[PDB]
Each structure stands twice: as C-alpha cells, then as structure tokens.
C-alpha cells in the first residue's frame, strides 16, 4: 500500500540508442586501441641519428611515430 | 494617512484602489456580464475540442496564429512613411552609427599620430 505506480516517459528508446551508440563506437574503439598499443610497445618509435655520409633518406624515415 | 499611490508605467495600478470600481454604472455591469459570456463560450468551445478521445494533434489556437502573423508578416502592410517614422528611422539607424564612426576616427588618428611620434609602449608589442 505504501508504494505507488510512478510515471516516467518511455525510457526504452533512450536505452536502445545509448546501448547502440556505445557498442558501435566500441566495436572498433578497443581493437584500434589494442593495435596502437601493440605498435608502440612492440615495434619502437625511432632514434635521432644523423644522416650518414653519401646516403639519402626517403620522404619517410623523417618521422618519429611508426604509424605516422 | 496615505501618500495617494501615484502610479507609473511600471508600478501598475492594483485592482483594489482604482477608485473607479466603487462608483458603478449599469452599463459596466452589462459589460462585465457580456465579457463573462465571451470567456464562457471560448472555454466551452475549447473544452469540447479538448476532451475528444479521437483527437490526436494540437488544438490549433487561432489567437496565437493571428498574433504571429500580425507580428511577423503584417507589419509591412500597413505602412506609410510619416515625418515621425522618417525622423525616428534616421535617428535610430544612422545617428549612433555616425557617432561611433566619429569616435573611431578620433581614436585612430590619435594612435597613428602618437606612433608616428613613436611615444607608445611598444617596447615589445609582438602579437599584433
């Protein structure tokens, strides 16, 4: 007798859009975070060596991060 | 013991001390009765368009649509350029504009003359 029916408008569409939003962001949020972490913990960034004598680098091998 | 309560355009005259409410004509009684009749007929039509279980959309208040089309589109007719309208138009449209234009001319001429002399505080004034 103490409890009564309380009225709240239609939380189902709220919850459905929120669940779909988080799932279809995190479907390739976590694999890309795992990918970038495994890159910069198992491949190296680079070192800062000078240009050797009689040698040319390309337009890559000027950049720190390996995915860059 | 009373300061007579002078009104203003912001301090509204309250419904108690009018004092025109206390000497009453019969035509004012007729007017109040017919005004009650108008509000009663409007509430009757509204409540009959309000409690239909078949009705779905909005109630289509004609006074709101009438006020909106009175306020937006029906300003331009009617209009004639009067001496009052032309005077107030050239006052509110051009006056303050030419005032701020005069003060910007004054400030810029002072500043450029002062830096032509060079006695500003631009010892380092880098992010211009």
């Amino acid at each position: 007798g103490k409890r009564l029916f309380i009225i709240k408008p239609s939380g189902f569409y709220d919850k459905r859009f929120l669940k779909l939003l988080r799932f279809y962001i995190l479907l390739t949020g976590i694999p890309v975070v795992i990918g970038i972490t495994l890159i910069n913990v198992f491949i190296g960034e680079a070192e800062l060596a000078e240009i050797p004598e009689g040698y040319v680098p390309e337009h890559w091998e000027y950049f720190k991060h390996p995915i860059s | 013991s009373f300061p007579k309560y002078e009104p203003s355009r912001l301090a509204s005259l309250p419904t108690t001390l009018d004092p025109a409410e206390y000497d009453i004509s019969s035509e004012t009684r007729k007017a109040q009765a017919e005004r009650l009749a108008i509000r009663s007929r409007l509430k009757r039509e509204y409540q009959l368009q309000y409690n239909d279980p078949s009705r779905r959309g909005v109630v289509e208040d004609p006074a709101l649509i009438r006020w909106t089309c009175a306020r937006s589109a029906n300003v331009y007719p009617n209009f004639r350029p009067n001496t009052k309208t032309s005077l107030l138009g050239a006052l509110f449209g051009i006056g303050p504009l030419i005032f701020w234009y005069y003060v910007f001319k004054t400030d810029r001429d002072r500043k450029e003359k002062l830096i032509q002399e060079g006695k500003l505080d631009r010892t380092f004034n880098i992010s211009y």
Partner: protein
C-alpha cells in the same frame, strides 16, 4: 453556393509507431530500417569517426612544427656557441642592398 476546391480533407498524421514497435527512425519496412541503423552506426562511427580520430590524431608534422622546434634548438645552440647574438636583425644583408640616393 461555392466551395472552390475538390481535394481530400488533409492530412492524416502519420504516427510511425503503432505498426512497428521495434522501429528505428524512418518508415515501416522492417528489414531496411535495421540496415539503415546498422550502416549509419557502423560506416558512420565505427570506421569513420574513430579511424578519422586516429588519422588526424597523428600524421606528419602539420605545417612544419616539430621540425621547426628541432631546427631552432640546433640554431640557438650554434648562435650561442659562436658569440654573435641570436636573431641578428636585418634579415637581408645590407651589403646586398642599394638605396636610392637623395
């Protein structure tokens, strides 16, 4: 004694619910509504937004910023180790100038 019209009494307000309770945003086809929701939340977020965030999160040094950092470090080390003041003014050499006379 006139009407001036003959068309339908219009409209009927199209409640997009009450025939698909599981419906997404648009009209009452059951399959292609699901395909629209799936394609906008996959090929609009899962491959566009997050991969765009990783792409423009890091890329080559945009408008030559970190190169400018490292080149300025080297040049300030040089110009402090060789006596002359760093950022000498008159960036064009006054040997290579010819003023009009008076």
């Amino acid at each position: 004694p006139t009407l001036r019209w003959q068309e339908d009494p219009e409209p009927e307000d199209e409640n997009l619910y009450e025939k698909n309770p599981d419906s997404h945003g648009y009209d009452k086809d059951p399959a292609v509504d699901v395909w629209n929701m799936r394609v906008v939340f996959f090929f609009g977020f899962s491959i566009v937004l997050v991969l765009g965030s990783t792409f423009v999160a890091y890329l080559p040094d945009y408008r030559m910023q970190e190169w400018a950092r490292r080149e300025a470090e080297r040049l300030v080390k040089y110009r402090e180790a060789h006596g002359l003041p760093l950022m000498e003014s008159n960036c064009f050499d006054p040997s290579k100038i010819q003023l009009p006379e008076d």
